[PDB]
Amino acid sequence: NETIPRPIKASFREGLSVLEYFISTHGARKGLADTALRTADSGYLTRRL
DNA sequence: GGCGACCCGGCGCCCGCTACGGAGTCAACTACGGGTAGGGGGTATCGGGCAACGCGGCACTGAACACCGTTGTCATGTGCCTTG
C-alpha cells in the first residue's frame, strides 16, 4: 500500500514497458489475493447471519 | 488487597460443490503341554423308484322277471232247416 513516483504513462494499446508491466503485476497479484480472502470472509459472514 | 494491565493460555473460526495424482517402510528364544481340530471309519436314519390297488361310471351280466300286445282257446250263444 504505497505509490510509485513515475506512474505508467502508456496505454494497453501502445503496450506497457518491462518495469511498467512488473509494477502493474505488483498490484494485480494483490488484487487476486484480496478477492480470494474477501470471498472467504463473505461466506463466513453469510453463514453467521 | 482489590485494581490493573498484561500476560498468557486457550480457544474459535477460517465461501461452495464437483472433479482430480500417487504413495505406504528399521532391532529374542525354546521348551512344553494341552486342546481343538482335522482325517477316515463305520452306522442309524431319512429319501427316492416301481406295480397293484383304491375308486366310479357305466356297462355288461342278461338273468330274471315284469308290461303291454297278441291270436291262442273255449264252452257256449244266433240263424237256418227239418219235423212236430
mmCIF file of C-alpha atoms (C1' of nucleotides) in Angstrom:
data_model
loop_
_atom_site.group_PDB
_atom_site.id
_atom_site.type_symbol
_atom_site.label_atom_id
_atom_site.label_comp_id
_atom_site.label_asym_id
_atom_site.label_seq_id
_atom_site.Cartn_x
_atom_site.Cartn_y
_atom_site.Cartn_z
ATOM 1 C CA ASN A 1 0.000 0.000 0.000
ATOM 2 C CA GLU A 2 2.380 2.640 -1.348
ATOM 3 C CA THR A 3 2.525 4.722 -4.532
ATOM 4 C CA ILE A 4 5.275 4.926 -7.154
ATOM 5 C CA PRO A 5 6.738 8.293 -8.261
ATOM 6 C CA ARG A 6 6.855 7.526 -12.007
ATOM 7 C CA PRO A 7 3.340 6.342 -12.951
ATOM 8 C CA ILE A 8 2.645 4.295 -16.054
ATOM 9 C CA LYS A 9 2.420 6.706 -18.993
ATOM 10 C CA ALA A 10 1.468 4.078 -21.608
ATOM 11 C CA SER A 11 -1.900 2.575 -22.518
ATOM 12 C CA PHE A 12 -2.570 -1.084 -23.238
ATOM 13 C CA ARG A 13 -2.885 -0.224 -26.934
ATOM 14 C CA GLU A 14 0.671 1.126 -27.044
ATOM 15 C CA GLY A 15 1.805 -1.579 -24.627
ATOM 16 C CA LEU A 16 3.474 -1.313 -21.247
ATOM 17 C CA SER A 17 7.247 -1.436 -20.905
ATOM 18 C CA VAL A 18 9.017 -4.093 -18.828
ATOM 19 C CA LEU A 19 9.203 -2.293 -15.485
ATOM 20 C CA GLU A 20 5.718 -0.872 -16.037
ATOM 21 C CA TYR A 21 4.360 -4.392 -16.502
ATOM 22 C CA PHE A 22 6.215 -5.565 -13.393
ATOM 23 C CA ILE A 23 4.887 -2.777 -11.171
ATOM 24 C CA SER A 24 1.382 -3.415 -12.529
ATOM 25 C CA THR A 25 1.681 -7.108 -11.647
ATOM 26 C CA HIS A 26 2.591 -5.952 -8.132
ATOM 27 C CA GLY A 27 -0.982 -4.733 -7.721
ATOM 28 C CA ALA A 28 -2.642 -7.421 -9.837
ATOM 29 C CA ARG A 29 -1.476 -10.296 -7.631
ATOM 30 C CA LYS A 30 -2.535 -8.394 -4.513
ATOM 31 C CA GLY A 31 -5.949 -7.865 -6.083
ATOM 32 C CA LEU A 32 -6.378 -11.583 -6.739
ATOM 33 C CA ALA A 33 -5.353 -12.461 -3.179
ATOM 34 C CA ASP A 34 -7.741 -9.840 -1.801
ATOM 35 C CA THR A 35 -10.557 -11.268 -3.922
ATOM 36 C CA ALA A 36 -9.975 -14.762 -2.527
ATOM 37 C CA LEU A 37 -9.819 -13.590 1.090
ATOM 38 C CA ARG A 38 -12.896 -11.381 0.703
ATOM 39 C CA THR A 39 -14.817 -14.302 -0.793
ATOM 40 C CA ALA A 40 -13.967 -16.498 2.196
ATOM 41 C CA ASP A 41 -14.864 -13.768 4.694
ATOM 42 C CA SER A 42 -18.165 -13.070 2.933
ATOM 43 C CA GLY A 43 -19.047 -16.759 3.045
ATOM 44 C CA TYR A 44 -18.388 -16.941 6.775
ATOM 45 C CA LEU A 45 -20.390 -13.756 7.360
ATOM 46 C CA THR A 46 -23.309 -15.199 5.398
ATOM 47 C CA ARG A 47 -23.226 -18.367 7.496
ATOM 48 C CA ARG A 48 -23.227 -16.416 10.758
ATOM 49 C CA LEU A 49 -26.049 -14.152 9.579
ATOM 50 C "C1'" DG B 1 -5.652 -6.323 48.539
ATOM 51 C "C1'" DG B 2 -8.694 -5.253 45.068
ATOM 52 C "C1'" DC B 3 -7.444 -2.930 40.777
ATOM 53 C "C1'" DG B 4 -4.808 -3.223 36.796
ATOM 54 C "C1'" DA B 5 -2.645 -4.124 32.820
ATOM 55 C "C1'" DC B 6 -0.766 -7.620 30.746
ATOM 56 C "C1'" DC B 7 0.055 -11.774 30.082
ATOM 57 C "C1'" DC B 8 -0.967 -15.762 28.899
ATOM 58 C "C1'" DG B 9 -3.454 -19.589 27.684
ATOM 59 C "C1'" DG B 10 -6.881 -21.269 25.147
ATOM 60 C "C1'" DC B 11 -9.804 -21.447 22.166
ATOM 61 C "C1'" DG B 12 -12.982 -20.435 17.852
ATOM 62 C "C1'" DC B 13 -13.465 -19.980 13.186
ATOM 63 C "C1'" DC B 14 -11.415 -19.592 8.708
ATOM 64 C "C1'" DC B 15 -17.464 -19.420 0.720
ATOM 65 C "C1'" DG B 16 -19.438 -23.610 -2.297
ATOM 66 C "C1'" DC B 17 -19.611 -28.016 -4.955
ATOM 67 C "C1'" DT B 18 -17.990 -31.339 -8.289
ATOM 68 C "C1'" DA B 19 -13.678 -33.481 -10.231
ATOM 69 C "C1'" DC B 20 -8.563 -34.567 -9.679
ATOM 70 C "C1'" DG B 21 -2.009 -37.555 -8.742
ATOM 71 C "C1'" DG B 22 0.354 -41.375 -6.352
ATOM 72 C "C1'" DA B 23 2.487 -43.164 -2.029
ATOM 73 C "C1'" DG B 24 2.760 -46.840 2.031
ATOM 74 C "C1'" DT B 25 8.600 -48.754 5.077
ATOM 75 C "C1'" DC B 26 14.101 -50.430 10.747
ATOM 76 C "C1'" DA B 27 16.191 -54.089 16.452
ATOM 77 C "C1'" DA B 28 14.791 -62.992 21.075
ATOM 78 C "C1'" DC B 29 14.242 -67.596 22.005
ATOM 79 C "C1'" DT B 30 12.968 -72.535 23.161
ATOM 80 C "C1'" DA B 31 10.624 -75.960 25.611
ATOM 81 C "C1'" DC B 32 6.482 -77.942 26.965
ATOM 82 C "C1'" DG B 33 1.702 -79.154 27.258
ATOM 83 C "C1'" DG B 34 -2.790 -79.182 26.157
ATOM 84 C "C1'" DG B 35 -6.686 -78.850 23.422
ATOM 85 C "C1'" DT B 36 -9.011 -78.338 19.278
ATOM 86 C "C1'" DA B 37 -9.407 -79.709 15.032
ATOM 87 C "C1'" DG B 38 -8.728 -82.392 11.111
ATOM 88 C "C1'" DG B 39 -8.947 -87.079 8.863
ATOM 89 C "C1'" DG B 40 -11.241 -91.557 7.833
ATOM 90 C "C1'" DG B 41 -14.450 -95.475 9.629
ATOM 91 C "C1'" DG B 42 -18.355 -97.060 10.369
ATOM 92 C "C1'" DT B 43 -23.563 -96.686 11.318
ATOM 93 C "C1'" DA B 44 -28.677 -95.338 12.085
ATOM 94 C "C1'" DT B 45 -31.848 -92.625 9.677
ATOM 95 C "C1'" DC B 46 -34.179 -90.254 6.007
ATOM 96 C "C1'" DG B 47 -35.497 -90.025 0.770
ATOM 97 C "C1'" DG B 48 -36.052 -91.566 -3.806
ATOM 98 C "C1'" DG B 49 -38.059 -95.501 -7.542
ATOM 99 C "C1'" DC B 50 -41.931 -99.162 -9.214
ATOM 100 C "C1'" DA B 51 -46.859 -102.070 -9.949
ATOM 101 C "C1'" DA B 52 -51.452 -103.145 -7.501
ATOM 102 C "C1'" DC B 53 -54.751 -101.077 -5.840
ATOM 103 C "C1'" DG B 54 -58.105 -97.850 -4.390
ATOM 104 C "C1'" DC B 55 -62.235 -95.773 -6.740
ATOM 105 C "C1'" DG B 56 -66.722 -94.559 -10.254
ATOM 106 C "C1'" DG B 57 -69.296 -94.521 -14.239
ATOM 107 C "C1'" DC B 58 -71.209 -97.294 -16.625
ATOM 108 C "C1'" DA B 59 -71.594 -101.324 -18.505
ATOM 109 C "C1'" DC B 60 -72.378 -105.885 -19.104
ATOM 110 C "C1'" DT B 61 -74.220 -109.928 -16.810
ATOM 111 C "C1'" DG B 62 -78.716 -110.567 -19.209
ATOM 112 C "C1'" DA B 63 -80.879 -113.120 -15.596
ATOM 113 C "C1'" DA B 64 -84.991 -112.682 -14.055
ATOM 114 C "C1'" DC B 65 -88.514 -111.060 -14.082
ATOM 115 C "C1'" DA B 66 -92.415 -107.569 -15.328
ATOM 116 C "C1'" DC B 67 -95.509 -104.698 -19.283
ATOM 117 C "C1'" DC B 68 -98.370 -104.352 -22.703
ATOM 118 C "C1'" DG B 69 -99.538 -106.812 -27.110
ATOM 119 C "C1'" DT B 70 -101.219 -110.510 -29.350
ATOM 120 C "C1'" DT B 71 -104.192 -114.796 -31.919
ATOM 121 C "C1'" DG B 72 -104.265 -118.900 -28.610
ATOM 122 C "C1'" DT B 73 -108.955 -121.214 -26.955
ATOM 123 C "C1'" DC B 74 -113.117 -122.398 -25.163
ATOM 124 C "C1'" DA B 75 -117.543 -123.604 -23.916
ATOM 125 C "C1'" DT B 76 -121.372 -121.520 -25.284
ATOM 126 C "C1'" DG B 77 -124.620 -118.285 -27.773
ATOM 127 C "C1'" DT B 78 -127.733 -116.607 -33.089
ATOM 128 C "C1'" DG B 79 -129.813 -118.254 -37.737
ATOM 129 C "C1'" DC B 80 -131.441 -121.529 -40.966
ATOM 130 C "C1'" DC B 81 -133.626 -126.208 -41.892
ATOM 131 C "C1'" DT B 82 -136.396 -130.238 -40.685
ATOM 132 C "C1'" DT B 83 -140.151 -132.245 -38.220
ATOM 133 C "C1'" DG B 84 -143.910 -131.906 -34.553
#
